[PDB]
Each structure stands twice: as structure tokens, then as C-alpha cells.
Swiss-Prot record:
Organism listed in the record: Methanosarcina acetivorans (strain ATCC 35395 / DSM 2834 / JCM 12185 / C2A)
Protein's name according to its UniProt entry: Large ribosomal subunit protein uL2
Family in the record: Belongs to the universal ribosomal protein uL2 family.
Span list, region Disordered: 1-22, 202-223
Bias (Polar residues) ranges: 1-11
Presence of the UniProt keyword Oxidoreductase in the record: no
GO BP term, example: cytoplasmic translation
Subunit structure of this chain's protein: Part of the 50S ribosomal subunit. Forms a bridge to the 30S subunit in the 70S ribosome.
Keyword DNA damage appears in the UniProt entry: no
Function, in words: One of the primary rRNA binding proteins. Required for association of the 30S and 50S subunits to form the 70S ribosome, for tRNA binding and peptide bond formation. It has been suggested to have peptidyltransferase activity; this is somewhat controversial. Makes several contacts with the 16S rRNA in the 70S ribosome.
GO cellular component entries: cytosolic large ribosomal subunit
Record keywords, A-Z: Ribonucleoprotein, Ribosomal protein, RNA-binding, rRNA-binding
Pfam families referenced in this protein's UniProt entry, alphabetically: Ribosomal_L2, Ribosomal_L2_C
Molecular function terms from GO: RNA binding; rRNA binding; structural constituent of ribosome
Length: 238
RNA sequence: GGUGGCAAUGGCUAACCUUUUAUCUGGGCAGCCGAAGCGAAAGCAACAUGUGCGCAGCCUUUUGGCGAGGCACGACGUAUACAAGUGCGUGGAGUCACCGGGGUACGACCCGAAGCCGGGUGAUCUAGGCGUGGGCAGGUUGAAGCGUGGCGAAAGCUACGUGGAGGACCGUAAACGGUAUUGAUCUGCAAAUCAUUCGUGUGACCUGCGUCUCGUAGUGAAAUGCUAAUCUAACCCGGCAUCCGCUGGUUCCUUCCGAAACAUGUCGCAGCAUGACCUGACUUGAGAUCGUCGGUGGAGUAGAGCACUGAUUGGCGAUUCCGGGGAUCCCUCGCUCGCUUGUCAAACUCCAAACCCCCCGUCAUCCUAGAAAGUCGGAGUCCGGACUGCUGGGGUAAGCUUGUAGUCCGUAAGGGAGACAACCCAGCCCGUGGUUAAGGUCCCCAAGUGUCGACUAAGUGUUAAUACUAAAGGGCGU
RNA sequence: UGGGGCCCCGAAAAUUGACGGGGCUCAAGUCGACCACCGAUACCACGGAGUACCGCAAGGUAAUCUCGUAGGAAGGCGUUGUGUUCGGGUCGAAGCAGGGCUGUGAAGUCCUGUGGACCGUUCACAAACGAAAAUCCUGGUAAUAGUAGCAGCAAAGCAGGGUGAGACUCCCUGCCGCCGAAGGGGCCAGGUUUCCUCGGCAAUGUUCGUCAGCCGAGGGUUAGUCGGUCCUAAGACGUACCGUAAUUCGAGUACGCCGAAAGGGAAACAGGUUAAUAUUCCUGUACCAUUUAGCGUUUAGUCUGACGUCUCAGGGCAAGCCGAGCGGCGUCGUCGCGCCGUCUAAGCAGCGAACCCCGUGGAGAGCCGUAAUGGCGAGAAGCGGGCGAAUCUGUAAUGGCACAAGUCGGCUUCACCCCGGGACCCGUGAAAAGGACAGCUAAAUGUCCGUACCGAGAACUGACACAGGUGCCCCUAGCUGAAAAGGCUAAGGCGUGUCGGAGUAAUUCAGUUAAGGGAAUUCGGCAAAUUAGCUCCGUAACUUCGGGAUAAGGAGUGCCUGCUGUGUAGACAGCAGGUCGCAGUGACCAGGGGGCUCUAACUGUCUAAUACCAACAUAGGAGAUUGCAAACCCGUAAGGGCUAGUACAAUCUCUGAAUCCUGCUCAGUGCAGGUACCUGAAACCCCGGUUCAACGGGAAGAAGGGCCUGUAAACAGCGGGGGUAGACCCUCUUAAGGUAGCGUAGUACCUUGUCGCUUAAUUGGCGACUUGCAUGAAUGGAUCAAUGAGAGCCCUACUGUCCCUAACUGGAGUCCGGUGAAGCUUACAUUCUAGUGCACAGUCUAGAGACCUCUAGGGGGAAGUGAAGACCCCGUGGAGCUUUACUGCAGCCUGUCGUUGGGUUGUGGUUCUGGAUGUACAGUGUAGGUAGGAGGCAUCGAAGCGGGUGCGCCAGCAUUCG
RNA sequence: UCCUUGGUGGGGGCCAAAAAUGACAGAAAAGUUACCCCGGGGAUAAUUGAGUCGUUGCCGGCAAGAGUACAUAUCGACCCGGCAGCUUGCUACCUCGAUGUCGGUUCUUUCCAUCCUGGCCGUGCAGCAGCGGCCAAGGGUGAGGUUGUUCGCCUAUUAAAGGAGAUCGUGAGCUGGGUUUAGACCGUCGUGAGACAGGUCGGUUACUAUCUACUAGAGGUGCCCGAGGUCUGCGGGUAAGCUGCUUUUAGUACGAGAGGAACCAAGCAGCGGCGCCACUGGUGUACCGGUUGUCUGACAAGGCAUCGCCGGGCAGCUACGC
């Protein structure tokens, strides 16, 4: 048994690959709201989120609950965030995406209604509302795909704060090391051709090279799905 | 196999009971083997001797007779299903023990690895993640930002001060690391340390304590590195007395005999089986052939030869042929075919030995104190080597390699060659005496300064064989 | 002239050697013959043993018997025990040492001594039954050998006097020394009595020992305040649920519970006392918590606990320093200096710097601040107030000090305390208990555990009294100096772990110096040497504009006298003059530099114990999957990692900073998409078979495959020969035929390729050329400032690297006292030459040498020792790894069945009503199915007609609207 | 013939034929290891050793001929016969319970097939100087650049800068550059792991001497009137030195000139050997002085810092001196 790969170690869940969950502030999700209800809260602080490297807003709601929310661009302390079917379509409010006009920018989008917010959550970029239909609403993702979601799916109006974070080059190994200290990801990473054959399919040889094509079938079992997984194509665009 | 019990109206019991404490006595017929074989099966189913030879033994006129056992036939059962031939079987000897040998399976004469697998142990070391602490002498450099001032029409350009950034610089025997000396040490202070010299030394930094991640798993800035002096799969115990054709060992005496290192098959080539060869016993009962001489047969090797197959050298004579050279093919002429010369052959033979082989007779030797033959028990052995021949084959040759006949060493003493596995005498129970073999006789060293006739002047030589001994050529040396 | 014998030339090898050696010449050589003798275990003779065969025996025969490995066969000896026969022994059994006799022998018996209670023997039977070997095992014990070691630690001791049987080694005094930012002080983990006292010295201590961490006996650890205990952290454990064939196994959830002697935290100090404990006992002076009783009560939910890195201001302070007085000690050749001390806890009371806040104020052709950033009509300066520190002041005062003084000032102040500012993000830097906000008084209570001592060059760990390692300190005094570097000294701890020694030779480990030369040494400047601090001047190519840089290259530097400037000060900077030495960073400390290349961008990581590299990583660049009930991955499952995440994200790969770039090839393999057609298992269905099935076919057809398309920053490839001043049309092209670059390379076999510089000379380096055996673009190409314990070459300086060694220093060695191992070993052994021999002999053969013993010395030989060769082969021995080797198994894709229900339609017949609708030719009439081969109905029904209700040839049967 | 009996469908068997195992007396079967492990083997390879000598080095016989003529001053074709074992092969006898692998360095020794030095002979030898051969192994045979090199090339001296053997002498002497481990790069192979008598960077050299041998120093015993002194010399060893330059002979012999010798004589030099220390140089941790930092209160006198450092230096030892 040529040793298990890094992916198999991560699946095992050893401490080297676990997230430092104690370092994080909150599990950011939309406040739970009953059917046909609303709640208003005020932003009391803008804090740094170590799990995202983006700002988060601390919000005190009317019901006595203090909650961390994914902060949108321009959200400020003292702002009144409303969450409900009747909420004003304004930056920071939590409204169903059926009430958002086409061409509007949303973020923290629920995959299903009441899900808490799944899509469009990293620092800076957004989703666009494209079309509206009776049971379906279409949004262009940051990927470029079109996602048809329930119009009752909730989302905060605006973009995620922290745009341009990756614009500054890392410039330095330790610069990225300090970011990797707060995440589960292993840093740094050894190239597979630098390993021995027992450690990777690409390892070994008198000279560094994979020895086999790097595009691997989608049917390959765990321990073999390495390189370019089910690649539609390869190379730089012609 | 040796010794026994019983014996075709066969042998023995197993479990078990009888124990009165494992014995023992008497029971115990279930079963097994024998008693009928052949055939896949269905199935069918044989000699209580028809004949001959003949050992022992007996009788006998010493040549014959009877002749158990034995041998050879004949006959019959069944399968081959048509037939014919043939196979197996058939005229009652087995069975159960004790003491032995041997095969097979089991740890299987004893020890000897790496490994494979099960369940457990380990992150006090080391690697990495996390929590919470500690640490980094003293200096250097001087980013942005800010103040003031210059040069400019502005655009803008620019000096100094302040400021204190950086996986920045120097540097501590703080800490961490480990370059070079390939220094010390190298049964050490130390199962890797010491001295000097070096790299990092505000950061991907070092480090305490705590905690987590581990065996086909972990960890790894990736070397197959590290995971408790153990890492290309840790350690403990278990499978396990693993297995091996491979290595090592295997313990008292005498006596009798005494090999094979070879063939065929083998995933066989360091092994094994079968056979040859050794050994023991029994059966049988009259011949056998290691040697000689003569004869009937086989020769196709040596040698010889050119008569076949092919080579091969000139001379001579012809092919008015097939062909090389400068219009009547105007004439020059190599091969081809013969008579003579000169040479040849593993795979040529008109010839043709000596050895040798089969058979017959003969002598010779052995043999009823058991020929030849048969049956059974036990093996070892299939690494060989050498000398003398075969111009053995191959090779430039080889103390090379591979054959063959004999004999040796192996397993062979003693005597002699300086010593010498296998070269000479000789095969050798113990003691004594004598005479010899090989070889030697100037001394070492037992016996010749032996005899005769010559040669050698070179210390040549003083060397049977042997791989341990120098050639071609020349010499008015003798 | 030919044929012959012997000899000569031809004829050269390596330690001194071989006719066996001496030697030998009408021979002691050769040739032809001969004579006598010597000389085996052969042969003969005698005697004896065994063997084979025969014989009833007695005995007979053997020229035709007597070697022997593997191996077969026969008979015996011995050990221990069993049955059985017969015995021996305290008047001395077994065993043991030595000896006699017998037997071929295995062995038996006896004698002497020793020993003190058991032992044999006949015939048989058994076995845990016989040893010289296994790098055999266990135990004991040699040679080595009185040898190595008791030497870097680190200057290590000496004198005098004691103690004692005994003294280098134990005690005291003095002198001389070591460490002195650790070798001192405190303490974690760990140790576990090593701590203290007394008495010892058999062992331990690397010597001795009276000493001791050793031996024996006794003693020693005192807590409301110091820790644990309490809280929670990463993260464990328990119960429940669920899984699992099951569990002591398993993830998650819920509830609990633990998890820090360095995180948080209620509170105590000074002095004394013992031989050893002391914030613990005693004295004095305090403080905290609950509980009880009384006196009063919420402000309630906030704050605190509670936080990173770097940098800086202000204030304070332990330590430190200076001057005066006082009290001791030292010195005193002269002087009057030097050293020590000159003390004082918590608690209690008092003040309060900065920040912040409150009231006034009104500030701009701008004002106020800071070290710095800054602040301001959204309200500056100024003026009042509140809140609020370290520390300081008093008290605690009649404690300890020689009841000796004990009183004052000043400076500085880290590395400690308080407070405030700024910068960075890239880790945004914990939680909970507890505390505060309403408590005051008085009594009682405050349990349990630890507490000695070491904390390391002797108390831990590494087997050790081990030169390593082990938490470290938020521990460390004076001078020099930037300094905690180095040197010299305090305090404190030590002389603690073998001595002596006469030149103490040679040699060796580590150092000092070295004429002239200066890398000629060597693979190579390895090693050593040079330089070195600070100040000032000055600083190149190149460059990514940051740097290179301390580049390079120059000058100064000590002491004394008198001063100047900055600053509140500490101090710092500078000046003038005088002056000594070979030398002024005088010791200590402390870069050598430059030029040309390769390579990697850089800092970093690594083979703990041979590889610190160009390898790994890195930032940067590119590609791929995935919209989250995702991609990818773990688990048998329950359920998980990534994930308290969401494309700017995670995961999977390649390349490897910047700069200029990254060309052509999709034939092969891979990947993705498409599936028109072909192939494609099972189930269902159909046919046949089967009294039923098995079975044989058919249909349909998923995934997959064939097949088509795309894709090279996927794996990869980018080629042969000949006509033309080696270009160009063709080729060979079974996809294409090397673009930019680079090139004898870290790739170039030929090869020491050719030329130029570098040298006297260069298989070298660099540059150019390049016919590239076999360069080339993210299998990344070229190039590159800076960086580098990387790899080469050159220049300079330097030198014992060398020419070529010498002297000296300390430690070993040598000699002496004490202590005291280990490793090679079948035996013998004073060897040397040659030959022989398994062809590499101290032992064989023939010679030559050699009197023995001891000491020192370097290593020729003992094919020296260490070690079942790691190179090679073999073994139907292993292990890992690879793959289009064989065979499988997981994972994944897909069909079918179950889970799995209800509706709507589209597809096959399931099942049957209204007609028997049936008709080449003509029909009066439709075969009214094949039919009693003929025979029943009817105005209470039999037809010529409408689109003719079944049907059809606008006919005609059934009587229906007529 | 098919399990109680009979039958059906379907099986099993007997004899024969066909289908193949070519590794053909019949397994269904690809690699790699330098990350390797284990058991053995000198039954079998790298290396030294033994044999052989094709090959290599050095020769010989006959002399074909060349040499203005003339085989033999010089060269030596064709063929033939050898020696050595120093090149490379062949072989597998010894060693796989290890005989440490190349090259260099240090030190010793041997061979002659002689490079120089000594003595000779021939010459197509006038002299100078060559060419060829014979004897001769006493001495010498060096210094440097590249390369790990052996070998080879090159440089300047030199009388010449010969070759070879000693386990390709010499790792219980040294070195570690090369080759021969584990890491890594480049190129080429291979799909790959990996490989390359291709290149490149890096990469642990253990031991206290038992015996023997040698170098030196002692104690004995033997020999011997007891002791002492002085000698002899059986023997052993030696390189009881080797070799250049210059002057002279002599600008002579010789030669037409150019050029240009020899005997004898002298001095000097290189290397070697032996000894010595007046001179000169080094060292000189005896000693003397200067001075930095610090301590002993200052001065003086002292300690320490490598002898603190720096300067000088007698004796002694030494060579770079004699």
C-alpha cells in the first residue's frame, strides 16, 4: 500500500488538516425568521473575521439577540438592518430575492429558503439578479454560471466587503504563512514529482516528471484522482 | 525381515464388561484380513492335477527308478463383444503378535535467516497541528509618513531635519544549527562527543509545559527522512519447533564386504526419481566365461590410393563445337575432353590392417562347500581429478575445456624418486630372521673413489614420466 | 662432399640460492656393455591372531583369505533404571588423584592415598544411554599484563600545626590559584532521604583515605495568607442514544466531568529560634473568606478578570555611583588613602502624573502641541472642577547591630513597576471562575495534600561520581569597553577526584617564534597566516533604482596641561599647546580584498549518526474540478474531514522572483463531449424445449467500448539520403519536422575540437566559433541586480603549504609509587633463501643462519585483528516499487429487483357486446362458417329506396324511420 | 448406469477420433532496486596470485633490396624461430565466516633489454658533433603548467633528466583527487519504477603490537688461573664519494675555410657523506627593558591576561653557517 495521499489524510481528519475552529468568531448565517415575519436590528460594531479575512457586523436585534452578520459594502455601525419579506431593498437588508429588481447586486445567498446563506460570501465580489419568474429566479454567480433559485430565498442587498484583498501580492512566504496559520490548509505544499513513488502516482524517477498523463478520469478511485481531474481541456487559451 | 501362536472345521478381536485400584483372569464374532476372479458397469464366474522335466530325499544293479517343493505346458473363469489373439485369475495359506530395517504424514536427527499474517503497545525521543507561557547582550542601516528650506511662470525637481519599517545588516560558548579541519577521539568523556573555524540570531524565529495525529498507518519545506540507539512497512507476544534443494554439527569398540562422481526424465543444472555400481538374506539346482588357441561371421578405422564424389600441378594431343582479342566470321586462342608428370580429403574409397565384437569347438579357471538365473531388504552416488595412449574434438596455447580405453588418487599403507593425492616397486593382520623389487653405491646416506671401451673442457652436465627440461640458424670446437 | 656423437654461439629479470647440498673433469658427467654389493611391511621360513567355508565334535582347507571413504551386514564394551538370581559395605560403599595386571579394543579388575554410606552381580528387558568439534550453550578461569587507562576539563598546590595505628589526599591558619552574566543565588520536571548528628572503612570513590552523596545507628519536613486545592484553554474521559455479528470497538449529538505547581487567581509581613523546618514554630504588627447574631440594603445589569508584534515619551524604583560626618578593619619604606557599615517589612493613613470627563471661553490673510504622529466653530489655547498610578511621606518603633556608629545630601537607574502615545495586520492576538458596584460590628471556623535536600562537570537522564542532554530565571556587583563580548577583580562557591620525577630520549596532542624566497606544496592555498575597533576622507562596473557598500583605496588614534560648544542633567562633541616609545583600537576583542564564470531569485528546510547542495519549500505564473444535499476525501455502519468555510473559496496538479518570451505537431496514450451506426451482461417479454425446469434461440439494449469531435502551461514529439555562389522544388514525410533563443554546455562520444586572453609552459578558466553522438521554450528557453558555510579560474595581500627544517612552551610518552581492564590465541615457535605443495610456507624438502633474557622504538611480515563480502553469481529464499505481466479485490459508472404510493394520457392484448360481416365466374339467393348432401318460417311479416343503421360493386339479405 | 421400484427430460461411463501445451516426458504468467535484506558459493565473475603468450615489448636466421658503386657505415622487405611476462586477451587452479580496491607521497631494495657517467669497436669517423654495436648496474636520473591519473602533452634547466620488478612494493605509514553505496542535476533510453564501462556537485579511512623481523640500549651464561689494561682481526658494512662549469693545454692538433679537440695542471660549483658552533642567522616561555587593561589604597614592588603584547638577547641546540 503506497502511502495514502494528502487528500486521504485530510479526509481522515488529523490535526494537521483540521481548521482552528476556536479562532473563529461566529458561524455567519441569516437570523432565523418565521414564515411571514420580520426583525430589525442595529449594527454596533465592525469586527475582523479570522475565518474569512473580511469584516463582519455585530448586530443587536429587537428580540435581545446579538448576532454576527456577513457585512456588505458600506454597512456602518448604527445602521438599522431589516430582515423580512417587506424589508426595503437597500444595502444591508435581508430580503427575498423575488423582491430584488433585475440587475441588482446581492450576496450571502441561500441555496434554499431559510438555509442561512451559502453563496457569495468571500471578501469583495457579488452575485447579480438577472431574471424573475413565478417560481424561479435567476442569478449570475461570481463564477459566471446562472443559478436558478427559489424567489423566497433570502439574500443581503449589496456586495461583500473587502474587495481587492487578493490584489496585493503575497510577496513573501511568511506573509502567506501567517494567513495559513488560521486555516486548516497545509502550508507549504510539496510537488508530487518531488515525492517518492510510494507517496504519489507522480513520484519517483531519475528526473522530475509525472511519467503519466496528468488528466485523470472521473472514475478513478480515492488515492488515484490526482492531477487534472476530468479536465474538459488543457493549456493556455488559443 | 528374524522368532513365534493358531490355521481353511482360518486368524485376531475393537469398543466394552469382569480389576478385588491401571497389571491380570475370563468374556466380548461388531468388524478387518484370508477364503474367487475379471470387468468402468450390467453382469458372469474358474484345475481337490491332464501331461512333461527335475533338485533334495529314498530305493538301486552306481546306472537307472520314484520324486514333495520347483520349473514348463495343457485346460478353464472373466474383459476386450463380431472374430482371432492377448491381459488378469484359477489345482486351500493365511492371520495375529514380539523384536528389527525402511517409506509417507505430522516440529520428524539438532541448530541455523530475511520474511508473511493475527491481536495489542508506543508521539518521555523525533516529525507535524493546536492551547498557554518564556526568550532574543550590544550595535548598524535608515522605507513610508511629517517639518522647514531651496530651484521653478507652473508642470514639477530637489537639500537637510524628524521618523523608525524590513522573513534588512554585524555579532555573543544567550538560544538554535552543524560548514571545514576530512583535527582530537575512534575497546572514546560520548553506541557520534570535544576543540577551533563557521550559518541563523524580530522571525516561514527558538523553546518549556500541556494536548492531539501511528503501523500498509501517522508525520514529513519530500531525504524513503522521522515514528523511544529499530524504518523501502516500528515494537511486543502469538501462528512458530514456519519453511529452504543452502551452511554447520550428529557422541563407544572390533569383525566381514565395499562403491559411485555415470545414463534418461525433471522450471532440471548446488536437488530428486528410475537404472548402472555396493551390501544382506532367501529361492533354485548345473553350468558359467575374466584369459588362450583354431574356425564360421561383422567390418570401413589406421595405412594406402585416385576406381566414385570433389579438390589439385605442369608437359603433350585433340574437342574443326559452347568462348577472350580488332562482310568471306580473312588467321591470333582461355576453358572442355584424353596420355603423361606433381599433389590431396572429417563429412572420398578400387583397397585395407592391428585392436575389438557375436557365435562354435578347444584348453584354462570357477562351480553341488552351490554356476547362470530369479525374488526381496538397506543404501550411498549423478561437483570429480589425474597419468599413459587415441596426431582424440575445440583452441595460438594453457596445471584450459570437452570425449574415449586402461589404471590409479578419491578411499591406498610401506619402500624410492629433495619434498611429490594420483610417477616407480608394492597393494598392507602381529612378531622375529633371511633374500630381493624400485632406486642407489665420493660425503651428507646403507653399499664401488667398481671394471672395460670411448666422448665432453662447456661446471656443459650431475633432471625416467610429469608441464617442474629454450628454438630456428651456424661452428676450419672436438 | 654427405651422414653421425658430444660440446659451443644463438641465450636478457627482477630479495641471496639451488645438480637436493657439498663438491665433482681418463669423473662423482655422457654413451655402449659388465661385475659385486646395499636397499621394503614385496617374497621365503617359523610362531601367533582373526576371518571365510566345511565338519556332530575333534578338527580340516585357504598360492587362489587379511588396504579402505560413502555405505550395507555381524558380534561385543559402557551409562542409568526394571524384573529376577547371587552378593559386597563403618574391620570403610560411591566418587576422586596416581599406579599394577588383563583384554586387539570399547573397557574390566586390583593396589595406595583420600572419602564417610551406600554399591554391585546372573539371565533378560527398557532408555531423557556414550562428545573433541556446531563463529555450540551455561559456569569457571588463563595468555594478553602489572600492560592500556587514571593527560583537553581549567594556573590543580605549598608551608606550619593538628587528628590518627596509618595522611599528597581528613581538619585549622597563612600564602598561591580556579569560576566570577557562571562553576555563584532561586527553583520546574525528575530523584526519593542523597539532608542533619554520631560511629566506621570489607566493598564504592578511577590512587590513598582517619573523608564522603559509601556502610551502620539515630533524627529531621509543622501553613486560612507559599503552592496544589478553585476556574476554564487545546483536548480527553463517563452516561445516554445510535452503529457494529459483537465488544473493552466506532463518529456525532445531549447531559455531565476532568484538563495549567509558568494561563486567571481572596488574604502576611520583618526579626529571632534549630544540628537539620520555617512567609509554616516563637515575638511583634497585620490581612482574607465563608458561617452565626445584630445593625442596613440593590445601581442589576454594567465594568473588571481580559490579552498580539514593533517602537517611543513621561514618572518612579531594586541594584549602582559620588561628597560630608560618624564607627571599625587594612596599610604605614614615604603618603593618607582603600575597604566595610552607617539599617527599618507588610498593614494603616495622606497626596496624586498621564489619560478621560464636566463648566466656561471663543481661535484663522491661522493658532496650539508632540520625541513623533497631530488637534481645532462637529469648538483650539487659556481658566476652574471631578476621576485617577507607581512611588513618596508619616505611622507601624523601642526590632536586629561590636546597647559601634547608626546622621545627611547629590547623581544615575537598567534588565523591574505605573502611565500614555504612535505604527503594522499578515497570525486581530483565549475562556471561565473570581472580584467591584452596600456593607459595619462581635464571636466561632478555615479541613486535606506538598514542604528535608540536589536541581546538576557527583544527588535528574544517558548502564557510571559519563566533557552529552535536561525548565530555566520575567537572576547577577566594580574597572575597561557599545556591551550580559573578552580580560582583571568582588560576593558566593571551590583547589573534587591519581601521584612523584632525575632533560622528563625518540615520537606524539595542542601552541609560540622563525633568515631568504613567497603557493614553487597540494587534486585544490586544506591548514596556517594577513586584515580587524572607532573617527574622518573617499568609494567602481552593474542594477529590479532598493542596492552593490564596511565596496575598493587613504589619514588619524596614547599620555599630560588648559579649555570651547550642546544639553536641566547624566554625559557627548570639538579645540590649543606640551610630551614618551620600535609600536597609542599598544593587552583583550576584532572583515582580508578584488576580477571573470556556472548554478538557485532571495530569508528558510533536509538524509538525528558519512551528503546543508544546484535538492525541497517559497512568492510569482498557468491549468483543472465544483453552485454547496457541490468537488475531493475518511468510515463496515452510525456518521465525519475540508467546514464556525461558499469561486475573491476549497481541493487537485505543473512550473518556480523580476525582465524578454513561451513557436509547430491531436498521428499514439490520457482526459472531456457527442453517442448517427456497430458491439454490449442480467432481469422482463416472445419462440422452442421440458406433463414442470434446467437448456437453445429471438427481440430490446444501460454503462462501457468501437466510431466522430475538441484539448499540448495534458503525458509527449519536433527526422533520414543526393542534384544548386550549403541554402532551394521533391522526398523518407506512416501528426509535424526545431520558431525565438542557447550551444564542445553541470548536456558534446569524437575530445586534451579550432582560435584569442590568461601561464615560461595550463586535458584548466573566460570569450568567440560551433558539424547540437544526444539543446530549446511552464518536460519551461534565454538572461539576471541582490543574496550563497554552493561549484571552478585568475590578481593582490599574507604566510612553515613548500624549498628545509630548527628551537622553545604545556599535556602525554619515557623512569618511579598506587590502582588496574579488554581485544586476536589448535599446538609449537630464534629465523632467512629457494623449491615443493589447493599454483602467495616461521613448521614440508635442501641449504643458510641462529647463545639466552630484558628494555625502548616505528610498524616490514604473521596473506595481523575487527565481520558467516554490502561487488558478482546462485536460491523454482524475501521485501518494497512500477506497469498496456497474470489473477483478483475495494472505490466509482450503469441495467434490474426491493424500498415504492395515487392520478393523467401514449403504447400489446388482455376480454367480448350490435353483425358471421365471406363476393373469380353473377346470383332466382350473401358458402346463413366444416354441417343429418337436404328441407322451416310469412300481412299475428317477405323485397326491388333515402348518406343504403350491420356490410358491399348507390346490387341484396334482416322488415327496422317509413 | 443415476442412490425403494418403472418411465420421461437431463446427466455419468466404456472403446476410438479431433482440439495443445515448440520451455515440445506439458505451471494459466512482465519489469526494477545504487533504498535493498537473507542463505550460500572461490561449485561462479571485478582485483592480486598460478598457467598461456594470440596480442604487447625486445630480439634472432636467410639476407631481397636501398645506400651516386657496394646486402651487412646505416636501414632491413617476404617468410621462418624465439625470449620476457613489465600491455591487453584466454582460462577459472587459490581466496566470497573480506588477502581493503586506482593514482600520488614517504622509504628500502632488485633487474639490464644502458638515458648519462667509465672502457671499447665500426663508420658513408678530418675536427667539432653524430650514427650503429659490445662490455659495464658503482653513482646519478631533478624542478615545474594542465589532468585523479598511470600514460601522454608542454616549459625551462640539466651530463642525462632510461625503463621495469618487489600482492600493478608501500592505507595495523599517509592522502582521498578518481573508481565502487545511500542525495541531486543535465543528456539519452524506457509508459513506468528505474538504468547508462556518459558528464556533473556532495559524500565516516577502525585497532593499546601477542609472535617474528629490524634499529639501538642493557642483564646474564659460555669461553676463562682471579682482576685490569693494551691489542689482533675470523668476519660484517661502505658511494672509505659521484658529477659538471671555468682557466690552461689552445684559437693549437684537425680543417681550404667556417669551426675546433685530447693528456697533464688549477680553481670553483651541484648532489651526497661525516663532523663541528670561532663567525653569521633562527630559537632561546633563563634574563633585561618599554607599554596596554585590571587587582593588591597611592608611590615603589608585584599577580594575571598565549611569555599579555612589543624590543633586545648570553649559554645551549641548530643551518640558512663552518
Amino acid at each position: 500500500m503506497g502511502k495514502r495521499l494528502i487528500s486521504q489524510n485530510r479526509g481522515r481528519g488529523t490535526p494537521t488538516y483540521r481548521a482552528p475552529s476556536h479562532k473563529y468568531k461566529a458561524d455567519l448565517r441569516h437570523p432565523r425568521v418565521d414564515e411571514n415575519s420580520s426583525l430589525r436590528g442595529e449594527v454596533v460594531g465592525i469586527e475582523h473575521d479570522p475565518a474569512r479575512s473580511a469584516p463582519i457586523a455585530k448586530v443587536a436585534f429587537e428580540n435581545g439577540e446579538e448576532l454576527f452578520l456577513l457585512a456588505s459594502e458600506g454597512i456602518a455601525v448604527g445602521n438599522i438592518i431589516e430582515c423580512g419579506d417587506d424589508a426595503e431593498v437597500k444595502p444591508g437588508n435581508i430580503v427575498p430575492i423575488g423582491n430584488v429588481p433585475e440587475g441588482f447586486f446581492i450576496c450571502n445567498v441561500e441555496s434554499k429558503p431559510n438555509d442561512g446563506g451559502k453563496f457569495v460570501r468571500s471578501s469583495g465580489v457579488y452575485a447579480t439578479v438577472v431574471t424573475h419568474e413565478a417560481t424561479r429566479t435567476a442569478v449570475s454567480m461570481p463564477s459566471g454560471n446562472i443559478k436558478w433559485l427559489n424567489p423566497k430565498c433570502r439574500a443581503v442587498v449589496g456586495i461583500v466587503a473587502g474587495s481587492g484583498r487578493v490584489d496585493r501580492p503575497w510577496l513573501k512566504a511568511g506573509k502567506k504563512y501567517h494567513k495559513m496559520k488560521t486555516r486548516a490548509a497545509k502550508y507549504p505544499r510539496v510537488s508530487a514529482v518531488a515525492m517518492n513513488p510510494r507517496d504519489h502516482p507522480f513520484g519517483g524517477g531519475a528526473w522530475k516528471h509525472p511519467g503519466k498523463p496528468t488528466t485523470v478520469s472521473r472514475n478513478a478511485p480515492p488515492g488515484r484522482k490526482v492531477g487534472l481531474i476530468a479536465a474538459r481541456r488543457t493549456g493556455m487559451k488559443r
